[PDB]
């Protein structure tokens, strides 16, 4: 017995970390937060409907300004919209129709798209010629690109279905770092607010904390019974929320190394597609497969509002940087801007 001895050692180590996680669990968040006041019904009206795509929308990303948003649909078109005036600033024609992810640079100078083409293509919006052109096609991935997010204008972290995430230097076009450890297609990636750490959600039903500079996983979070389809970091960056196809969302803590609360209901049996917190981290919005989009209070797991405005699968969801609007994008080629009305 050669492989059996150290594989045993491996399950002994994982049991050790399990009892360490269990030992540090002083109390559950639900009882700790049972003394706080409930948010109550949250009514959001669709202030703007961004019509214009002619195919299912697979991803949307707000610009740092909180006014421009990029949207990617399988019509082969990536459109930058002006949310305030429902106008289309640009409509980039994608080389491949199959787009599964879209990103907006923190500066706003660039946007990126990825998909079954297996390449993340960076587009330079600010050009002297006056047209948006592909600056760099990052092509070193074996599997489809699931989510791509920019740290700077030169560095972008991309998640793929080859079970690996990679940090890319746009100028050279080479992966500075490759993150390996997932045994299943990575479907989602969220960076820390400080952009020092990122959490990746995969079909192996595990989410791993990775550090961009060290190059490898720091922590692994388990507890989902099905593939994680969406992941989002809490505003502080000490927590993240994961949405899976078992119709449940879980809040994990990077310091307690374990989950804290689970957001599920017997009325919902459709898997999550995209999640995102509010500005203060009190509202965890989640887009579901049943055409709806619940608004979970991320402190008591009490469902506090539903955004029912779509007729197909809600695929993307994003709250602005100032937290003053929520944009949902579903498979009926319509984006919708929501905000609370007083």
């Amino acid at each position, epitope marked *: 017995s050669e492989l059996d001895q150290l594989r045993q050692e491996a399950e002994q180590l994982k049991n050790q970390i399990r009892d360490a996680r269990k030992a540090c669990a002083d109390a559950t968040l639900s009882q700790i937060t049972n003394n706080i006041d409930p948010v109550g019904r949250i009514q959001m009206r669709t202030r703007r409907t961004l019509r214009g795509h002619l195919a299912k929308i697979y991803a949307m990303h707000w610009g740092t300004d909180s*006014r*421009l948003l990029v949207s990617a649909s399988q019509d082969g078109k990536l459109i930058i919209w*002006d949310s305030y*005036t429902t*106008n289309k*600033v*640009h409509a980039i024609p994608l080389r491949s129709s199959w787009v599964m992810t879209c990103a907006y640079a923190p500066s*706003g100078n660039y946007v990126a798209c990825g998909g079954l083409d297996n390449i993340c293509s960076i587009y330079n919006l*600010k050009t*002297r*010629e*006056g*047209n948006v052109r592909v600056s760099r096609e990052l092509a070193g991935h074996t599997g489809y690109l699931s989510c791509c997010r920019f740290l700077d204008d030169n560095q972008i972290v991309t998640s793929s279905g080859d079970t690996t995430c990679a940090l890319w230097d746009i100028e050279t076009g080479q992966q500075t770092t490759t993150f390996t450890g997932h045994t299943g297609d990575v479907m989602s990636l969220s960076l820390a607010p400080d952009t020092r750490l990122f959490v990746s959600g995969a079909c192996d039903a595990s989410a791993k904390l990775w550090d961009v500079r060290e190059g490898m996983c720091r922590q692994t979070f388990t507890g989902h019974e099905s593939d994680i389809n969406a992941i989002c970091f809490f505003p502080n960056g000490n927590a993240f929320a994961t949405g899976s196809d078992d119709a449940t969302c879980r809040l994990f803590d990077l310091r307690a190394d374990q989950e804290l609360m689970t957001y599920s209901h017997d009325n919902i049996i459709c898997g999550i597609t995209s999640v995102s917190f509010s500005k203060s981290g009190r509202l965890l919005l989640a887009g579901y497969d049943d055409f709806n989009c619940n608004v979970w209070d991320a402190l008591k797991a009490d469902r506090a509002g539903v955004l029912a405005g779509h007729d197909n699968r809600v695929s993307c969801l994003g709250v602005t940087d100032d937290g003053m609007a929520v944009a949902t994008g579903s498979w009926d080629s319509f984006l919708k801007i929501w905000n609370g009305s007083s």
Partner: single-chain antibody
Amino acid sequence: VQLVESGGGLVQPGGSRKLSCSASGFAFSSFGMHWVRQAPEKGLEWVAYISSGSGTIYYADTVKGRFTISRDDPKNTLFLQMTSLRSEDTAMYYCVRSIYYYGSSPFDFWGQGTTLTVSAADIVMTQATSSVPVTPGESVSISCRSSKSLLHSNGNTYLYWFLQRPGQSPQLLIYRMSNLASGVPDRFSGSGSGTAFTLTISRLEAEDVGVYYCMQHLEYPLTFGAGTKLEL
């Protein structure tokens, strides 16, 4: 980017002349194009504007009806045919770029210019000539005033600042009263409060000499300033 122009010169009064603006180096089919003219020993003055795809066309009331404007985007050329040229239409005509989306900077690149020598209400902007004998290393503030509040309800303040070197075409310094144009040094700055605007230069060098113009952009009848000239 390059905007070369052809046609224009000695025109007998009461005649006609067509001016061509050949655009090469950018997507001409997606740029709104304006024509601006500058009378000799005088400031600039707007002439005409044609939107992308010729969808919307405007003219200045001085030349409205007498002038016509059209673009040929398959060959990337903008045209201006003038009829019944009087003695007041003698000026250097500039063919400028302009693109209008959120965050865009209109009036990016100005044309070379062609001299026109014909022989034998609205918003007005006021700025004194103020030929200041400046020296390299002086902080200068250039102020122009508007008859109306330039600040629109959406938040923008459609004031544009232009700089024209002696013997060269104008360029964009600051657009919307606070946004610096891409290409100019950081030393330029601007501010305002709806009226009585100013442009501030902190590290004035020997290159920042010429005539400074300020322009409104709320309504299409457009008006420049008198032009502040900096020497020495």
